[PDB]
Symmetry: D2
């Protein structure tokens, strides 16, 4: 029972954002934006392509020039702007929470309580680091005085998905701006609206023109323009592994720009006999079914000891049947829609393979409703390692429960995947928890919990689930360029 927007929501910002002003698309074309729940068109946004990006890049490069406000400005002041921006987002919390819920098909409660809270907390965390990005002074051999500067890199192209459009945005700009970089953000073609509102707040907060630029458009057009641009120093991507390979490839052909990928995963869970079953069942459920299972950190594969396998499956099903599919703005709705028809069809396709390959359908396993892209909360059991649903990322409300007996084997089964974004370990024994977590090849390992991401902790992936960390102290290292200054002196003294 949360406060809803008193007025009716009325979209305003639907244009390209360069030098803290609203540009039209160079082509003049505009793409539509729909509510995934109602399939209704909300508005049309300016369709950005290369020409638009080239403008944004030249604005960002100009803003990054030596002697510009952004470079000369105090580190403390950069954080002050980030902290003001957080306050502006907190002010327009109902507006954004509503807009995110409509556009992203995201439960309003989650949108208000998780996403908007996450944006504020993270921005404020990032504000803190601004004037705490310190270099080093090295006691080098010889009569020399050596010191390093953790400078900003420069123009950073930043590509975000549709699953958490706001949170994902702050994860990009927050660290980047804190370190003193200028950014060219390309939001998803599905979910540009939320980001564009923030662009207005960035102007209002008083960020120098060109520091933040936002170019809404399609992936192959605008996104490719960023990945291959010759004056972009870094690219930051979050999306399918398929595209991540094109981003890194296009970065190689262009100007060897720096790369941070945050790709999807088939994140496994291991539930040993000695485990709080309710804890494990609830967190594993939340892990895989959060935001219609449209999380990179989805608890896809859930390995369970034989002794407690049947009991786990029993509880996981009854929990999954207590969902009410409908409009995310509607109070009482506990599950929302998929983003678009592409995911909808993909998820249903993998659900069919689960049946065809002969996994036991415990519940769900089909679409819901005439209107909207709604998928029933599905649960598969007796799943094998060589099934499509136990290999490919689903990115929908589908849970796979699998049994094990040997601890050594299940760890190797869990690690047997090109992905490795996260994992979950559920046990009371310390030795087990520490050793298992050390063995698992995951970027973030949760013990007796799941999906616990915060601003302070660094979040990334092993193998083909990422190419860098995004948060915490270590996340800031990848938005800086380390210059080494070695000065000759007459005599050195320790």
């Amino acid at each position: 029972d949360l406060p809803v927007l008193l007025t009716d929501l009325k979209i305003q910002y639907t244009k390209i954002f360069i030098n803290n002003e609203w540009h039209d698309s160079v082509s003049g074309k505009k793409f539509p934006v729909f509510n995934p729940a109602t399939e209704e068109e909300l508005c049309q946004v300016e369709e950005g392509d290369k020409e638009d990006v080239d403008k944004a890049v030249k604005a960002a490069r100009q803003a990054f020039q030596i002697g510009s406000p952004w470079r000369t400005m105090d580190a403390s002041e950069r954080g002050r702007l980030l902290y003001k921006l957080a306050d502006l987002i907190e002010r327009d919390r109902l507006l954004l929470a509503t807009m995110e819920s409509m556009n992203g098909g995201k439960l309003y409660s989650n949108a208000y309580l998780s996403d908007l809270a996450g944006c504020i907390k993270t921005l404020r965390y990032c504000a803190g680091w601004a004037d705490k990005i310190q270099g080093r002074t090295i006691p080098i051999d010889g009569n020399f005085f050596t010191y390093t500067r953790h400078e900003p890199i420069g123009v950073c192209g930043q590509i975000i998905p549709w699953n958490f459009p706001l949170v994902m945005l702050i994860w990009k700009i927050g660290p980047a701006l804190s370190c003193g970089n200028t950014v060219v953000v390309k939001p998803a073609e599905q979910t540009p609206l939320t980001a564009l509102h923030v662009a207005s707040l960035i102007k209002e907060a008083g960020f120098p023109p060109g520091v933040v630029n936002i170019v809404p458009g399609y992936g192959p057009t605008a996104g490719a323009a960023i990945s291959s641009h010759m004056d972009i120093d870094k690219v930051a991507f979050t999306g399918s592994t398929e595209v991540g390979k094109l981003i890194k490839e296009a970065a190689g052909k262009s100007n060897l720009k720096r790369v941070t990928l945050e790709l999807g995963g088939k994140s496994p869970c291991i539930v040993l006999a000695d485990a709080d079953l309710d804890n494990a069942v609830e967190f594993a459920h939340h892990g895989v079914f959060y935001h219609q299972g449209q999380c990179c950190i989805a608890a896809s594969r859930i390995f369970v000891e034989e002794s407690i396998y049947d009991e786990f499956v029993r509880r996981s099903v009854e929990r999954a049947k207590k969902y009410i599919l409908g409009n995310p703005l509607t109070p009482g709705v506990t599950q929302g829609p998929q983003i678009d028809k592409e995911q909808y069809d993909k998820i249903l396709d993998l659900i069919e393979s689960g049946k065809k390959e002969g996994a036991k359908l415990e519940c769900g396993g089909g679409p819901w409703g005439n209107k909207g892209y709604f998928v029933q909360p599905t649960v598969f059991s007796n799943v094998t390692d060589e099934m499509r649903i136990a290999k490919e990322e689903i990115f929908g409300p589908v849970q796979q429960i699998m049994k094990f007996k040997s601890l050594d084997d299940v760890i190797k089964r869990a690690n047997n995947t090109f992905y490795g974004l996260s994992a979950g370990v559920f046990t009371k024994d310390i030795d087990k928890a520490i050793t298992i977590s050390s063995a698992l090849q995951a970027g973030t390992v949760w013990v007796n919990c799941y999906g616990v991401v915060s601003a302070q902790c660094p979040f990334g992936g092993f193998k083909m689930s990422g190419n860098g960390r995004e948060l915490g102290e270590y996340g800031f290292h990848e938005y800086t360029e380390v210059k080494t200054v070695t000065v000759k002196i007459s005599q050195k003294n320790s």
Copy 2:
């Protein structure tokens, strides 16, 4: 592989060490050094007093002068000397292990396998840090370029006890020399010999004269001279809390020199129901009975759940009766003597109080042998909080086993002490281990183990068990002085 010294050991270095040369005592007086096992006199060492210290200090200050070899020398090279010294100690491992065992009354096996191994590992660890003590460059407000230098402090007075004369020495000089400090070491009046041999190796390794100086003597004479000296920048102490208060007091009256104390403790152990009893019993036993219980980290108070109290007491006693008291140079002797008659009498005094105050004597509880200061391995049970043996540090082979029922209470009972050097937690549950360890007010908390100190981990104490950390990354911070250099510039750029 326990090789014993083929030849009979013959002492050589028994003199004051200043400017890498052997001085006599200014007074001319000499104190004796006995074997605690046989009570035989080994030799007489030069008795250092203030005049001797004043010489050592002026040598150290000279060696620390701006432009001296030690200051100009590369950071890498300081580590190279430390690493060479470790190799020299490894060469003379049998010589030192034998000498330590004779002088310190220390089991030869432990002396060879623990102490000598510890000296080498630590020196080599400290060598590594030499050229990795880096400062910072601050992104300060205004048009300024700020940077910090983690310089050495200067002349560091270093006072060591008798329990681990070698290991304690390396813990002082290793970090100190790595950071580029000069040291004036005062070894214990009981155990100077081991340290003096190392002094020869420090010369052989090619340390500049004056960098390391060693002044063997008595505590109130030489030790007080160090604590109150007007040209000593830092003092590093390890001994009784009684004296620690005099060191800090004398530092206040003199020149506000920096202080790091490493005092004794009444370190408790908490053994919950869900614990590997054999693991707990063995580590708790080792904790309290290691080196005749002459460790600062002795498991004095051992709290046990009611359910497993009697069983724990049963196993702790049978383990304690399997000791063979005798000469520590005999390899199948499993327990050695106390250092001197002072400790011997003190330990017996506290054992009497245990009986008088009405604690149950399970085994031991009396002296052993005609010759040597040997105390029987004693075990008390049904011990209360307001007993002398449950409050005062014994520093002898005496174990106190106590029962609890409430987890919240025993934690407060454990913390209810002015000491707080270490603690021990024995449980299988993670939540318990983490929470209990967080609650306990101890410098080092061991989970399902005890007495596990290494070079990499920082070791110190809460409350009146210490005033600083000595090892690891953090231990080096206390042998450095941070200079801040702020340079005015025309224009700043991030």
Copy 3:
């Protein structure tokens, strides 16, 4: 031309602050507070003694209990309260700036532009660190999992002077509270008012009761109670070296509490031939004459090359004669009064010694006015090393200008002092600047500037000018206690 307080200032908070509520003095006695300019009594504040401290300590200890709001509260939230407090101070900026100016005898412009700005910036800096105080995970030898927690120490007694009552307060509480400590602050007997107003803002900001406690009183009474208290874990002092020695001494006799001193200095300046004389003259002037030269970082001794000695003296005098002594609230007044009659008499005493010992009085050199403790801006030249004015800290508007010829000599002359809080180097040559700054034994060395302190840079002193750093990353290390948790595991893997 600054905004002045529209209303007339009316004091309100004049009582002891414990558990976020206003207590009376246990004795019932009250000490007066005067305006140093007019010698008028402003009000009377409750006089705190031991009984009052013992209350405050028990409130702080209660607030630091395991499970209390302050301990359980998120690190991010501790910073949020600190950031709110900064906003509250920014709101009541005119109120505090006026109150500080009246009570402290501080130029309103400086009070508003420097002090109040400094309080906000520092609090906001300290807010940032709250959730960025990270421990370590050590790759220790053996099958163990080691990690460290940078916990808060606990109850921290904090003693502040009268020169910058607000700024000095924030330098204490800011880092302390950020790390999660509870504080018992004792403000100066001269300048309690400013601190007490902030106490109201600390309540308003919503800090848990007992976290911050303020006990105004006299030094030997309340201050001694803190220094020797048996339940205070740390003491933080800033004042005379005389008392610093009593603080450390009383800490030794009590409970070996941790100590950070920030004492006075005889901070020297070295001005080489190749220097922007106007830059050097202006900064050296500002250095020694800021806030009536009542700074710990006062440019007492100013060494100048022979070639430019006479020219420097000439310009330093004409600058010093352009001061208008009067009420600091009066517009146009460029210099204010000394804090009390004690300093007034001390400063005049040292001015007499300058004449008696035969230093050339260039200007000033006497008192001013019938009312108020005003000293004329004095300048001495042809000053020698063995003069009282070239040794003892004056803490008044008196400048000593001295000549040199050898660079090596003047460095040794500069270092020839028990003090070493700061220094100043004025040259165009890099080699010179770096080498000289490396040679000087000062906590903060300014190059072609002076008195440039910020929140980001760590500020302390060498030798008898301090016992720790207060700001920056390193300043926070001294408000934390490092717990080491070593967990036994079955098998370790890198």
Copy 4:
């Protein structure tokens, strides 16, 4: 006058190195290795291709398995092996110095004094970090205990050039092995011999089989196999920018392996009026002409103030004419040959363009000798920005001297390049040095020096001169994978 090898050098190790044993090429084919000075064939080495790499990778992966010696082994012990290896290289210093000089066409004195010294120093530096690669413990929001492990990545493919075959090798394996990675090294097709000898020392030092593997072969064959291999986690490259783009591209198509590039540069020098001309001339000369100008950090473009332009050119020429081209093993020879005919022709081609495009040839400008690939030390003056010799990397003994007048302009001219590996600033003014160095877009900036690389300082490049740092504290961050372990607890306490 250095000690030369007493015996005649006789090659032994000329085979593929997998699991610490000598394999033949799967194909059976062998490529020759020539002395660039004499053009004589030294020997034939086994020609590695994919099949050989696939073997090496599977050996490395096996050695990296959880529970293997390399993973379980103590961090301290990994450094001990690295330190032993350094000692073995120091023992075989004359052997390697001679072999490097013969194979690499490298001045014996430089080979012995620089390269072999560099290998030892760096290995020993890297040994130090082994047990000092610490993670963090985050004070995360919520009741959780978060900690990070800086684990090794895994199998690291490492590709080295021919210019400094030994030093470049240690820069790869040293950090990699210290962090606990297994490596598959591919040495240059020109210079495999030196690396293979070290492989014998790696066995002798007692590194577990499979930890280090070396596969000599051609770039497009073996190198491409590494860059596109599906079980290689990281690739580390050092060579032409041309190939760097293929490495990153092949990494995108394969398994999104991590990438660190260390490409060439057109590193500029800026010499202001106020500069020690002899210092500038000597360092700028050394910078561009070191090892026949076959350094990535070559001082290609040398900008000089108008006032001192002619004088600089005058001194730079007379210095360049004092070179004696011949066999690098011959005493008195001051310049050696280029590596192969490819570089030889390329360098001569660019020298022709210098004449054709109308740059003033001051000296040299043509080949030397009938035998060997010797190029005359060439100097161009009156060089413009749009010349081939002022844009393309030459990688030969050719110096370009250019004039400026505006400081602002020359900085933009210096930064106007896709390269940015290093730079050089020569001035006495501090403000100038700091500001200019801050403005320049170079990975390493030298002030009043050039080519001063050490193990402690991190070395890399901006823009298209690199994709990471290789040395110092920061260099180790790129041979680690950060796992985040978040544990749910009942109650959190700070």
